[PDB]
Amino acid sequence: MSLLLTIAKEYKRLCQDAKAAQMMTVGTVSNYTTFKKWTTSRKEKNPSLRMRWAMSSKFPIIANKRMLEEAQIPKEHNNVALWEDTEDVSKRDHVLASASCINYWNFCGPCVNNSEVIKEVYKSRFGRLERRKEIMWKELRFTLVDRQRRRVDTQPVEQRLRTGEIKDLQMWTLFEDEAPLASKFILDNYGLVKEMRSKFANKPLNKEVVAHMLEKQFNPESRFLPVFGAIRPERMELIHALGGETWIQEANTAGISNVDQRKNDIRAVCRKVCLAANASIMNAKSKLVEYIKSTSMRIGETERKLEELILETDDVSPEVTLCKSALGGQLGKTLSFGPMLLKKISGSGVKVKDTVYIQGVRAVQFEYWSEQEEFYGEYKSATALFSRKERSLEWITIGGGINEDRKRLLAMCMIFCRDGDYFKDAPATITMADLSTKLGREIPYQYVMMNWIQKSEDNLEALLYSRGIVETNPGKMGSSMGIDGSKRAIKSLRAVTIQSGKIDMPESKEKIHLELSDNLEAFDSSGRIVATILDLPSDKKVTFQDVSFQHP
Amino acid sequence: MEINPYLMFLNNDVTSLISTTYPYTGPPPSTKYTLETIKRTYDYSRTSVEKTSKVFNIPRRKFCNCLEDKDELVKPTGNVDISSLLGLAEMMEKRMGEGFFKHCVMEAETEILKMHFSRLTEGRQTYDWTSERNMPAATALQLTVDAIKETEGPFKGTTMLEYCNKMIEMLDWKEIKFKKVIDSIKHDEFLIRALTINTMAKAIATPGMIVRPFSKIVETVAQKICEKLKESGLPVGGNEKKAKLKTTVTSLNARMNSDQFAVNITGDNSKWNECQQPEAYLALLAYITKDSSDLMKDLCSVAPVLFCNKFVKLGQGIRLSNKRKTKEVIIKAEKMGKYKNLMREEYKNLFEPLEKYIQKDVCFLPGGMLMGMFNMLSTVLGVSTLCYMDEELKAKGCFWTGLQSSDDFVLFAVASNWSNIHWTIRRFNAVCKLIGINMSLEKSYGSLPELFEFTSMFFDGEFVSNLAMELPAFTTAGVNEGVDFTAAMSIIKTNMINNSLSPSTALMALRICLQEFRATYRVHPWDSRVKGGRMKIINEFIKTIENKDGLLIADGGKLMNNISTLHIPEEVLKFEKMDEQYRNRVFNPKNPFTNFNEAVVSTHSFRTRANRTLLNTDMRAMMAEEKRYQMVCDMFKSVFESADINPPIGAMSIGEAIEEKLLERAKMKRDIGAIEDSEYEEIKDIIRDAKKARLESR
Amino acid sequence: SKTFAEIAEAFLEPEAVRIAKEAVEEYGDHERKIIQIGIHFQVCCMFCDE
Amino acid sequence: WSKADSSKIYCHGIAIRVPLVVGDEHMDTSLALLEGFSVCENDPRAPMVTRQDLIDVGFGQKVRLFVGQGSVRTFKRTASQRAASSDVNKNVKKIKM
Amino acid sequence: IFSFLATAADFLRKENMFNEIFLPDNEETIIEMKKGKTFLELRDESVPLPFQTYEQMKDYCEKFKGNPRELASKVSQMQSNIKLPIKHYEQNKFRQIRLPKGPMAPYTHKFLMEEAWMFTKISDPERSRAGEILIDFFKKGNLSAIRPKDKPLQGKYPIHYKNLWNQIKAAIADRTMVINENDHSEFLGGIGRASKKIPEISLTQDVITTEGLKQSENKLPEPRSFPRWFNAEWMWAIKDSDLTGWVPMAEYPPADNELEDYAEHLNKTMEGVLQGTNCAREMGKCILTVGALMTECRLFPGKIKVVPIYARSKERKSMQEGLPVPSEMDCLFGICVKSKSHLNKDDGMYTIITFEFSIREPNLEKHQKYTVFEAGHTTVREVPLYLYCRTTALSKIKNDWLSKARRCFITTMDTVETICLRESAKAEENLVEKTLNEKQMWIGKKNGELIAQPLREALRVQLVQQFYFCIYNDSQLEGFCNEQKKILMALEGDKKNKSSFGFNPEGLLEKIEECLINNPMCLFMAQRLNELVIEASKRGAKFFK
Amino acid sequence: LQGKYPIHYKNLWNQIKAAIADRTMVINENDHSEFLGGIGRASKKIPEISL
RNA sequence: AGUAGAAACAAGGGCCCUG
């Protein structure tokens, strides 16, 4: 209205000037961002002291003028100063005032029809309060908690998105008249945009605040923290009130904002598609891509495409890694070897073939790296920091908490490095039927030994026996491991140190591109096999709910 | 009795009480310093070979590959043998892998090219080459782009590469204009003024705007390198370096043989900055950039040479006075030469050797480094030493590893006998002396395993959280009422999670913060008897408040927050109980005060008054330009309500967008809304006239 | 997003990325041009339209 | 189906996406037409319309339109968004024969 | 094609990659740094010595190959011409720290602690303001008796102080706490003793001759010997004050889980212990007096205001017998004034003046700063009086930090619960009350024996340590407390038979003894550190006698 | 609309639907039912001899 | 007078203003 005319007259006055005309005429609009910085540049060394010094003054708050006149806020309610006619030097459109004014405004000022909209603006914090109300606190105890420093997420979030996708969400939920050309995401996920739009349409609100709060709503805060017990976002948000190095506040938090069942379902679906698409020897990869694209799953209310979910997820698991590779998604520097986790701290190497006779004389080639190489490892409730050297396990330091898991970790690690005589002279039991070509595809020696150890405990005991056994010297009794994963013994496995306390997980914010072969062998710009289809559960039957496999 | 508080260290662990020593509960606390720095720098370089420049015609002492005066080598030496440095670089490349550095310089080039030239505003105070004063980055950037515009033509560039090529062209220009209450300067004065680096006593350097972007490029590549290395802790912080040290110790205790025995050494290098040379950095950056695109080779090489020709400004000069001290004269650095007689003997003796290097209010220094400039490149250079390994050590069964951050390191030596431990340590000291890196003998100490210190973190079986370091954090920032309390609680939460702060200490600090908050903002509880401004009106209208619980702390509230509710602002916990009148009034977006960070936006989120000292100073000419940009931004935001959050993009200029959007809005509101054809025609005519005027004027 | 290839993969299909990469390697020119050449190829493909 | 997500049809638990070419009483909004429009060769003769009037334009009719910030483009109400992946894959496979 | 191109241009413009650089035409395909004539001229001048052109340096570096034989030879030659010393402490022991020599360190804190005598008055909630409290105290008439004598017991500039005390009393009667500018206020406040700047253009050899002109002969501090009185202040500060509630603390919030109840019980116990001491009385006196003085200097600069030195407290709780519901109390340790606090810049300077009462004879060595004045008599029976009149100075930073001396509670609580939780975890049981009641913490020596008392009474010692760190903080104490850690680490090494070693400890001791000057705390702490190493030498090594 | 423990009830409802879909009335996971049954009373017990 | 440190303050700008 008349305001429009005021804006036009202002623009006219601006163009009548010479300098403003030049800066508007030249270049594009992005210059605005630049201009947004050359102005309002002022900081302060010690903010605390400045604030305390200022607050003593009669009028420490700049404020709007016309809004105060409109609201019939007088200068003095009752012998108490609130503001005085003046102009702030910098803004030139504001008048000094005092803090007392807020109290007056709070107690007798203008009242809006409804303020329940705040519950939508800060849905994260109200969710925090609602979750906290359902925690049954049991009992404080005292003990030396074992804490492992690992990266985690500290905000339960649904439909986690990237910065690029989110930016359109803010524009398409608040500022539609200035929305950019329709993107793929907005077209695909239109139920979410409609749902957000309805709540924040035809409402008196500071739009910028809502946009910033939606940014925080869709950001899972990842932090590198000490941790104990299960790993769930519901706990990490208040871990500070669950336990420290010396105390533990027991509490049952299982049934709040379940976020693990959807991750589990996604991994199960990826396993199912990866196992389906192994039939086509010649064109497994193309079948896999088509299979992924023509599938979807329901998240809460909305239905999302599996391809986008895989890109967003951060599950460093062999199932997801291959699928991310096929789509082209970049992923973390995290290896795998069966149901085990690995992370190369240092070292190098180069492939070197060696023969293994399976039975009598039956040569079978297997490749082994040739250099020193340190490796963090992680099996269930156990961890390690081993090192290899030229087809030999130099040492392994374990810091787990279970005997069975310790033995399994040690065995899979020994296999990883192709140490031991068995690799030179294969066990008598293993045959050529199982060696390779279960479905016409060769299976290298290491995965044969891995299957062997899983098949029977006796094979595992024999493998561990293959590593030399010595007598536990004095003092080192505590740092020793028997065959049953004992804390100490009289005789123990050679060069197998044991300690208490989980080995701290390393960290690296790197992204490596990795391809995959026709046989689903994920190469990563070098020989390493990050993942394969021969490190997944054999098979299992499941009834998936709220999923769409729209493929014949 | 004679009370002694240290006796608790006789029968109690020293780490579990080391926090008691830190006096972090109290307030913490020129030219002579700079001259001493210059003297020590010229002294460390042991050589006497001096060249003569042609550009400046000033003797240029050469601080590399000219070692002489091999007396008392224990002390700091700043001469460098490029051969050894390059050999160490080769050893690191070999260990890391083939072509380790190419991937890094690629990951830097991926950013340097697309980088916008406005990211120089987010930086420490930078010297201005027009007024000759330290100034925030943004104002200096605007000033130099206005000088460019006045000189030859508006800066069409929008990216870093264009900016760097424009600075390089600006070095060639004979004359440079720049706005002032509009002086012109010949090529030599601007050549000197670009390199000049000021100082701030926060000491710390303040490099010119000209150098800044190349410094960013070099720091970017050095960062991309350091992040990969496992023997550094500069980019990382807090937990990460603890985990690094713990994994290193496990590796050590496993690798060493039974005959062998480990040792530790807490080291604190000395004269880090004084002894680092940018010429070795130049050669090193050349070696790193041997296969990568020819583009990075030139760009990286600039900053080392610029630093190798840097001047250093002397500030505030000496002060003269009489006996009674009644009168007092002030004298600047430029005039020191004149009154050489009127100074103490020590000051004269220090000043006289540097007169030849000294230029007006500057001292040309052909080398050396200053604080904060090249932290990560020195970290790389120092990590090089830890890698070193030769046949002799392996023959004797000795090996040293460690973890270095800037000017602070930790060493883990291994051998089979003390006679060999000492020899190993001496070998390390030698290899570090070959590249300037020294070691302090007093602040540095060693011991048998499990007793070291690294960046104020003492280590034993456990790691005693300093707590003192985080004690200043338990203060009201002084932003606004809503922000302060929430930020304090979040700080307590972080200190609880990481520094293992106890629950009762957390509660006590929370209560201390609530009472200091109540005191600063002149608030107090409703039930108290205090009188004053806010409290009086609070009492006046308190009767209306039916539910006391929901009352906000600033508005006569009570504490409803604890250890289990530190991750939730009070405005949220109190929402249900709050009365509807108070609730709606507090959260009514039509607020004069509210200006726009895990916090709720209420009327309390105000902004402070602005300083007024400038009111008297004639710093107003700048205010005009700032006001011009402010107006343009203000009304572009008036039209487009999403200009700040989502960066604008397009091909139209600002004027054209305003023109078309305004016309379209006018048409939409004439179609249905309350506007008349006369009004619509008037608006459109106004727009046409304004456009014509804008185009015609310029 | 630390290398150009990721930025091209943000919108371009990875196949055209690999193609333009091999082409750049064969010519020996900077890889900064993976962005332009890939675009040139995708137009051609979507020109064909089968 | 549901009025919340008006862009899905559940046939025997199978999700069938409906294109967004025409609004409906519940789904009616600026979004329900976005797919229908596409960009074309610039023609300065076509008119410049409001975002809301997009609903009323004829099929196969050109129109100029301000988009985002500082962008004036030309939109033609004919849906031409074929699969890009398929064409590239097919053409690239031919290069290997 | 045009839709794809539009999307692509949006996704490029967003990343700042819509330029000729990434999207050049056929011709503009050669981007290169615009090498300028001067930049090359410089680069060819900054090259190392053996090389003379950037081309040679680049050609020598791009092909550099490793020759470990030569590198080892150079390393060994540098390892032979150095002879880095290694010194195992067990053989080369730590000589005792040397303290300077001279007169005793004198009292420097603004507000007297032990000596100061105070006047109490029943609390009035209505009249809670500073000036109002001072008026109420003055009206009873006990204050109006003071009539100092002309001759002071000691000190200098007496007449000025007497005049200003009279003017303060005159001020209150008029109920206007503004002092006029007279000779006495001018001299004490230094209103006009600020040197006037002289321009250099107006200078000449004749002017230099007329009035001496030479660079200021900086008068560095002088050395002062160990104070023998600090221990008395500590011992007195470790006793109750016949009252409680000295420092303001907030309320305790609700509770839901066992953890909060435990935190609130421990905090209640510690606060009860810590609110009764005398140090905490000084905490309150600093918080309140500096708050008032901060809010006066902010509002009325250019007016030499009068501010009281006061505090608020609460009489203890006896049994239900007698008068129940104990009352509150306003205490008046003394009065302060602040000369003009025109604090144009951060870390300013503003002289203040402090009058404070006493019933004790002044020591010459300790109370050198003050200028006492015998002031009649006082009831309790009758006792002589002594009016301690100082002329100190303050700044913004000292004000803000003193007003935040309440920090000591956090540190002391953390240390105590760091000991109690650790002791409780080793046994996996709630052992806090037993630890607090029983655990003995050595706190000194008496009669050549080692005194010990439970933790519950050594919290007071810790609190005094943190408070004094707040009070006497300076550069000296900073450097000292930063350089003494090495000695404590050596002590720990001695306790655990870890054969520590060092390169040059004598230099370390030199650095330490350099930063011990005219600050009582540093000197006292060093003397204690020496007595500690002595006492430990009986059960340990690495220290000489 | 008016409730104290919504999340557990809604999660148990989804669990019931997912179990019925599986053609088995059983529920394997026991987290929500346990909570909602134990709010009345659930705690440890100390032997008198250890007293 | 005093502070504190290895130099600065002990008001500064135009009869009027300000942190």
Contacts by B399-403 with C-beta closer than 8 Å and gap 24+?
Answer: B400/B424, B400/B425, B400/B428, B401/B231, B401/B248, B401/B252, B402/B231, B403/B231, B403/B232, B403/B233, B403/B241, B403/B244, B403/B245, B403/B248, B403/B454
Two tokens at A358? 């399976």
The DSSP element (H or E) to which C19 belongs, if any, is helix C14-27
Per residue, the 3-state secondary structure of B650-696, as one string, reads CCCCHHHHHHHHHHHHHHHHHHCCCCCHHHHHHHHHHHHHHHHHHHH
Question: To the nearest 10°, the Cα dihedral for C18, C22, C28, C34?
Answer: -20
d(CA B478, CA B492): 17
Chain A segment 52-111 residues within 8 A of D by beta carbon are none
| Alpha carbons D69 and A465: distance in angstroms, whole number | 72
Coarse DSSP helix, strand, coil percentages of chain A, rounded to the nearest 5 percent: 35, 20, 45
Burial, A439: exposed, middle or buried (Cβ in 10 Å; 0-12, 13-18, 19+)? exposed
State the nearest residue by CA to the C1' of G1. E188
Q: Print burial letters for B288-317: b (CB count within 10 Å at least 16), e (below 16).
A: bbeebbebbbbbbbbbbbbbbbbbbbbbeb
Token pair belonging to C19: 């193609």
Q: CB-based burial of residue A105 (10 Å sphere; 0-12 exposed, 13-18 middle, 19+ buried)?
A: buried
**Measured between alpha carbons, how far is E282 from E246 in angstroms, rounded to an integer?**
9
Pairing assessment for the beta strands E119-122 and E214-215 based on DSSP bridges: unpaired
The residue to which tokens 């163009």 are assigned: A15
The residue whose two tokens read 């394997």 is: F28
Are A258 and F5 an interchain contact pair (Cβ–Cβ within 8 Å)?
A: no
- SS3 label, residue B217: helix
Strand (E) or helix (H) holding E441: strand E440-446
- Contact between E145 and E385 (Cβ < 8 Å): no
Residue type at E412? T
State the helix-helix crossing angle for E485-495 and E475-483, rounded to 10 degrees: 20
A376 and A449 in contact (C-beta within 8 Å)?
no
List of B residues 104-163 with CB within 7 A of strand G: none
CA pair distance B513, B485, nearest whole angstrom = 7
Rounded alpha-carbon distances, angstroms, from residue F32 to A250, F9, F12, F43: 17, 8, 7, 17
Does the CB of E369 fall within 7 Å of any strand G atom?
A: yes
Of E252, E250, E405, the closest CA to residue B514 belongs to E250
Asked if B606 contacts A51 with a C-beta cutoff of 8 angstroms, the reply is no
Binding site members of C: 40
For B618-641, letters b (16+ CB in 10 Å) and e give: eeeebeebbbbbbbbbebbeebbe
Instruction: Give the resolution value in Å.
Output: 3.6
Closest CA to A385 of B449, B250, B245, B414: B250
Q: Where are the beta strands (DSSP E) in B122-244?
A: 126-128, 133-135, 175-177, 184-186, 198-200, 204-206
**Helix/strand/coil for B541:** helix
Say how many C-beta atoms besides its own lie within 10 A of residue E175's C-beta.
10
Q: How far apart are CA B111 and CA E179, in angstroms?
A: 65
Question: With 0-12 CB in 10 A as exposed, 13-18 as middle and 19+ as buried, what is B26?
Answer: buried
Are residues B73 and E81 in contact, defined by beta-carbon separation less than 8 angstroms? yes
Experimentally, the structure was elucidated by cryo-EM
CA dist., res. A373 & res. A393, Å (int): 10
The C1' atom of G6 and the CA atom of E514 lie apart, in whole Å, by: 12
CB atoms within 10 A of CB A127: 19
Half-sphere exposure of B194 (CA within 13 A, CB side): 23
Rounded to 5°, the CA angle D53-D57-D61 comes to 140
Question: Look-up: residue for tokens 């005789």?
Answer: A491
User: For residues A397 and A497, what is the distance between their CA atoms, to the nearest angstrom?
Assistant: 5
The two structure tokens encoding residue A382 = 């156990």
Check the CA dihedral E233-E239-E243-E249 and report its sign.
Answer: positive
**Cβ pair B112, B220 in contact under 8 A:** yes
Residues of A with CB below 8 A from F22's CB? 543
Rounded to 5°, the CA angle B567-B570-B571 comes to 120
Identify the burial level of E66 via C-beta atoms within 10 angstroms of its C-beta, where 0-12 means exposed, 13-18 middle and 19 or more buried.
middle
Chain-chain contact of D88 with C44 (C-beta, under 8 angstroms): no
Rounded distance between C-alpha atoms, residue B395 and residue B389, angstroms: 11
Q: Do A302 and D5 touch (CB under 8 A)?
A: yes
Give the Cα separation of A318 and A137 in Å (integer): 37
Burial-class residue C7 by CB neighbours within 10 Å (0-12, 13-18, 19+).
buried
Q: Say which amino acid occupies A10.
A: E
Q: How many CB atoms lie within 10 A of CB E525?
A: 22
Is the CB of F11 less than 8 angstroms away from the CB of A134?
no
Chain E segment 5-34 residues within 8 A of D by beta carbon are 6, 10
The maximal CA–CA distance of chain A, rounded, in angstroms, is 107
> Cα angle at B443 between B442 and B449, to 5 degrees?
110
Determine the residue type at B285: L
Q: Give the residue among B638, E404, C40, B13 at the shortest CA–CA distance from A10.
A: B638
Contact A255, F8 (CB under 8 A): yes
The answer to whether residue D61 neighbours chain A at the CB level (below 8 Å) is no
The token pair at A20 is: 């403003």
Q: Is E168 helix (H, G, I), strand (E, B) or coil?
A: helix
Contact A485, A474 (CB under 8 A): no
3-state secondary structure (DSSP) of residue A396: strand
* E507-526 residues near strand G (Cβ < 7 Å): 514-515, 517-518
Query: Which residue from E210, E285, E207 is spatially nearest to E241, judged by alpha carbons?
Result: E285
What b/e sequence results for A461-482 when a residue is b if at least 16 CB atoms lie within 10 Å of its CB, and e otherwise? eebbeebebeebeeeeeebbbb
Query: In chain F, what is the straight-line distance between the N-terminal and C-terminal CA atoms, in Å?
Result: 48
Q: How far apart are the first and last CA of chain C?
A: 33
Structure tokens belonging to residue F16: 């019931």
- C-alpha to C-alpha distance for B81 and B132, rounded to whole angstroms: 37
Q: CB under 8 Å, gap of 24 or more: what pairs does E30-35 form?
A: E31/B161, E31/B295, E32/B294, E32/B295, E32/B298, E33/B164, E33/B165, E33/B168, E33/B295, E33/B298, E33/B299, E34/B165, E34/B168, E34/B169, E35/B168, E35/B298
Alpha-carbon distances of A294 from A185, A291, A519, A547, B278, rounded to whole Å? 17, 5, 22, 11, 58
- How far is C-alpha E281 from the geometric centre of its chain's CA atoms? 18
Does nucleic acid strand G have an atom less than 7 angstroms from the CB of E343?
yes
Three-point CA angle A311, A316, A319, nearest 5°: 80
Give me the sign of the Cα torsion angle E508, E511, E515, E517. positive
Burial track A300-315 (b if 16+ CB lie within 10 A, e otherwise): eebbbbbbbbbbebeb
Look up residue B629 and give its amino acid.
Y
Q: Exposed (0-12), middle (13-18) or buried (19+): which is E319, by Cβ within 10 Å?
A: exposed
Q: Which of E217, E213, E197, E193 is nearest to E205 (CA)?
A: E213
Nearest one of B646, E14, C43, B660 to D73, comparing CA atoms: B660
Q: Which residues contact A171 (CB under 8 A, 6 or more apart)?
A: A178, A179, A180, B642, B646
Q: How many other C-beta atoms are found inside a 10 Å radius of the C-beta of residue D8?
A: 18
Do the two chains B and F touch, given a threshold of 8 Å on CB pairs and at least 3 pairs?
no
Q: Is E210 exposed, middle or buried (0-12, 13-18, 19+ CB in 10 A)?
A: exposed
Q: Which chains touch A (3 or more CB pairs under 8 A)?
A: B, C, D, E, F
C-alpha closest to that of E510 among B270, B5, B441, B37: B441
For the record, the structure tokens of B215 come out as 């410094």
The C-alpha atoms of residue E473 and residue A268 are separated, in whole angstroms, by: 63
DSSP state of C24: H
Tokens of residue D71, six digits: 């962008």
**Residue A551 distance to chain D (closest CA, Å):** 10
Q: Is A518 on the interface with D (CB under 8 A)?
A: no
Alpha-carbon span D44 to D47, nearest angstrom: 8
Token readout for A482 is 């028997």
**Strand G contact residues in chain E (477-496), C-beta within 7 Å:** none
Q: How far is the CA of B625 from the C1' of G15 (A)?
A: 35
> Separation of CA E221 and C1' G4 in angstroms?
10
- Name the residue with the least CA to C1' distance from nucleotide G9: E349
Q: Which residue has the tokens 């907005």?
A: A186
Which nucleotide shows the minimum CA-to-C1' distance to residue E478?
Answer: G5
Please report which residue ranges of A337-470 form alpha helices under DSSP H: 403-416, 421-424, 432-435, 445-455, 457-466
Closest CA to B578 of B589, B566, B587: B587
Write A161-170 long-range contacts (CB < 8 A, 24+).
A161/A185, A161/A218, A161/A312, A162/A312, A164/C10, A166/A214, A166/A215, A166/A218, A167/B646, A169/A193, A169/A196, A169/A214, A169/A218, A170/A211, A170/A214, A170/A215, A170/B642, A170/B645, A170/B646
CA B111/CA A315 separation, integer angstroms: 28
Q: Do residues B199 and B34 lie in contact, with contact meaning Cβ atoms separated by under 8 Å?
A: yes
Q: Tokens at residue E303, please?
A: 């007016």
Nearest CA in chain D to C18: D92
Structure tokens at E459: 């919290």
Which of E259, E298, E396 comes nearest A140 by C-beta?
Answer: E259
Q: A143 is written with which tokens?
A: 């003990």
Let me know: does C44 contact E2? Beta carbons within 8 Å. Answer: no
Which residues of chain E make contact with A144, given a CB cutoff of 8 A? 425-426
DSSP string, A185-211: HHHH-HHHHHHHHHHTSS----HHHHH
Amino acid in the structure at residue E283: M
Phi, psi of A314 (to 5 degrees): -125, 20
Contacts of B553 (CB under 8 A, 6+ apart): B485, B514, B517, B518, B523, B559, B570
Q: Which of residues 234-273 of A touch D (CB under 8 A)?
A: none
* Closest alpha carbon to B401 in B261, B249, B270: B249
Contact partners, residue E301, CB within 8 Å, separation at least 6: E340, E341, E342, E343
In the chain, the amino acid numbered E187 is: F
What b/e sequence results for D19-32 when a residue is b if at least 16 CB atoms lie within 10 Å of its CB, and e otherwise? Answer: ebeebeeebebbbb
**Gyration radius (Cα) of chain F, Å:** 16
Please name the residue that has the structure tokens 């409001």.
D50
CA-to-CA distance for E345 and E348, rounded, in angstroms? 6
Contact A197, A173 (CB under 8 A): yes
Cα–Cα distance list, A378 to A342, B656, E226 (Å): 6, 60, 60
Half-sphere exposure of C19 (CA within 13 A, CB side): 20
Q: What backbone torsions phi and psi does residue B453 show, to the nearest 5 degrees?
A: -150, 140
Residue B11: count other Cβ atoms within 10 Å of its Cβ: 12
CB B227 within 8 A of CB B211: no
C-alpha span between B416 and B432 (Å, rounded): 23
**Distance from CA(A398) to C1'(G2), angstroms, rounded:** 66
CB contact set of B346 (below 8 Å; sequence gap of 6+): none
Yes or no, beta carbons of A255 and F5 under 8 Å apart: no
- Alpha-carbon span A263 to A1, nearest angstrom: 53
Using DSSP, how many helices (H) and how many strands (E) does chain E show?
19, 16
The nucleotide lying nearest E216 (C-alpha to C1') is G7
Q: Calculate ∠ Cα A450-A456-A462, nearest 5°.
A: 75
From the list B19, B84, B697, the residue with the least C-alpha distance to B430 is B84
Radius of gyration of chain D from Cα atoms?
A: 17
Sheet bearing D71-76, strands edge to edge: D38-39, D71-76, D62-67
Contact (CB, 8 A) for B484 and A55: no
Q: 3-state class of A239 per DSSP?
A: helix
- Phi and psi at A96, nearest 5°, equal -60, 150
Cβ of C2 within 8 Å of Cβ of A511? The answer is: yes
Q: How far is CA B505 from the centre of its chain?
A: 31
Q: Are strands B204-206 and B328-330 parallel, antiparallel or unpaired?
A: unpaired
Q: In the sheet where B408-415 sits, what is the strand order?
A: B399-405, B408-415, B261-267, B445-447, E501-502, E87-88
Q: Are B309 and B301 in contact (CB under 8 A)?
A: no
- Whole-number Cα distances in Å, A532 to A317, A351, B41, E435: 11, 18, 59, 57
